[PDB]
């Protein structure tokens, strides 16, 4: 899963 958050 490609980082989202930021």
């Amino acid at each position, epitope marked *: *899963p*490609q*980082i*989202t*958050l*930021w």
Partner: single-chain antibody
Amino acid sequence: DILMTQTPLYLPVSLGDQASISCRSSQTIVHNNGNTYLEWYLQKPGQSPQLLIYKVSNRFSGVPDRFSGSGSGTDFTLKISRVEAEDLGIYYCFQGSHFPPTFGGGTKLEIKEVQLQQSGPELKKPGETVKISCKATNYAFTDYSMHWVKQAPGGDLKYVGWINTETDEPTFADDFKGRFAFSLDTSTSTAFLQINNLKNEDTATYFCVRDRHDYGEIFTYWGQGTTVTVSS
């Protein structure tokens, strides 16, 4: 942006004592999703950080209950009920709640299947170029992203940025916009970091890191790191 201040700089104990390390953040660190990404790392000489506590009070797999995290607001504390020999090293607190993620200055506790392979050390002269490599193994390279943390000669940790392993799209923290570039070879499941027009300030160990955010953990897998020595 968000400054993480640790207390104390040094912590001398005797095998068996209780240890407490605090960390204050210049701002609230509650990600908009309702999660507070405060995390505690233990780093031993020559190695890379080891995620211990994440989401303030959560112990990472393998971490013994002698370790416990607490706090709220801006002050956070890491407690070690009884210090053991293997606990010796530098403890770093860190927040991944707001970009760019940031690390505390570290506290040196002292006495009175997934793997990432990084290329070897580089000795360069100011002005040259370097392309450090990081080969991901035992996980779908394109599933997660690849992060890059810089560790200065002093020990300081800085987020360089990350790259979408699916879109080949990089994102950098402001202090790495300019001369840093991310790339990849999904063919060989490898992430690259290239620094152009090197400067003494670039001398540091760079680690590629893999997160596990869907699990709430940030930076759970680190490469051994690569040392770039920019000597004049």
